[PDB]
Design a protein around this ligand. Structure first.
Ligand SMILES: Nc1nc2ncccc2[nH]1
Length: 154
């Protein structure tokens, strides 16, 4: 019982792009760009489509960097999030009704205003490591349990 999601981090040598979600699930937190994968669509194509929809940016090659499974207690469906990174984009970031993008210097990543799991795996992403993670949440603020390990193959 899991549903496929994508998450894309535009990670350049000295900065990373995050977007402040304005409505819906996760509103009020900085995050990467992504969403649900459609019927008949590959995961990577879904990741590329959602980056465009939410940030206005065009990506070519996306690199697989992680898989994170999210459980919310009392909710049947697990979220199976496929995480990707890219350093080469086209376009400039677009603020819309749904998302406000902003660049962050790597020493100024706003962890207090991000999902709490990011403190665990974002440092791996910044050092070009790949990972498998699992986070069990109660509500949107409390991590009850988690696992996280580095992998050679996502
Ligand atoms: N970073 C992050 N994104 C998430 N989306 C849904 C649930 C938990 C999440 N943690």
């Amino acid at each position: 019982a899991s549903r496929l999601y994508t998450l894309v981090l535009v990670l350049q040598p000295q900065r990373v792009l995050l977007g402040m979600k304005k409505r819906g699930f996760g509103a009020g937190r900085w995050a990467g760009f992504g969403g649900k994968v459609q019927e008949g669509e590959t995961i990577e194509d879904g990741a590329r489509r959602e980056l465009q929809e939410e940030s206005g940016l065009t990506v070519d090659a996306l690199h697989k960097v992680g898989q994170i499974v999210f459980e919310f207690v009392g909710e049947p469906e697990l979220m199976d999030v496929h995480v990707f990174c890219t350093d080469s984009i086209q376009g400039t970031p677009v603020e819309s009704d749904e998302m406000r993008p902003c660049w962050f210097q790597l020493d100024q990543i706003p962890f207090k205003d991000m999902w709490p799991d990011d403190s665990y795996w974002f440092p791996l992403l910044l050092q070009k490591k790949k990972f498998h993670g699992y986070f069990k949440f109660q509500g949107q603020d409390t991590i009850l349990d988690y696992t996280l390990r580095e992998v050679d193959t996502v």
